């Protein structure tokens, strides 16, 4: 699945206890720039109303009947392109979100989630951003991910 428009909006609906608003905003902006740097996609942030990509933090059952599982295990999830929940990204706040090597790095997980938000599935390449298993190694988007997103949207 794929967006049929190149100009997308996002809204940060709420914030984790774990980080300042400024650090959350910085991580998400950097994560969208990963994808906008290698496609014609553009992302603009909204402070109210409906955005294409609605982003929120929650625990257990948080509104969509795909519940999170407490600390560890599932980290986050995102819906493929489409209306309503399509594109939206949810983060499990029973994890500890950071801008460091500790806990789970919000930038890295967000960049992966936004890959799903844009229509990418998982990669079998263990070095890819879209590999299903999280590890923590200046960020450079791996070549499998560049190839994958450009197949949908071009350079």
């Amino acid at each position: 699945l794929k967006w049929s428009k190149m100009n997308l909006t996002y809204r940060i609906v709420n914030y984790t206890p774990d980080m300042t608003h400024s650090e959350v905003e910085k991580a998400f902006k950097k994560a969208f720039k990963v994808w906008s740097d290698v496609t014609p996609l553009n992302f603009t942030r909204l402070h109210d109303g409906i955005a294409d990509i609605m982003i929120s933090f929650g625990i257990k059952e948080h509104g969509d009947f795909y519940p999170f599982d407490g600390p560890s295990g599932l980290l986050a999830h995102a819906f493929p392109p489409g209306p309503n929940y399509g594109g939206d990204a949810h983060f499990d706040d029973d994890e500890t979100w950071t801008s460091s090597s500790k806990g789970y790095n919000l930038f890295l997980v967000a960049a992966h989630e936004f890959g799903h938000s844009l229509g990418l599935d998982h990669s079998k390449d263990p070095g890819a951003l879209m590999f299903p298993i999280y590890t923590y190694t200046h960020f450079m988007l791996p070549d499998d991910d560049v190839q994958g997103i450009q197949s949908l949207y071009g350079p």
């Binding site: 795909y66 599932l74 986050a76 999830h77 995102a78 493929p80 489409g82 929940y85 799903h116 998982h122």
Partner: peptide, 5 residues
Amino acid sequence: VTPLN
């Protein structure tokens, strides 16, 4: 549609 982790 089931979201992906």
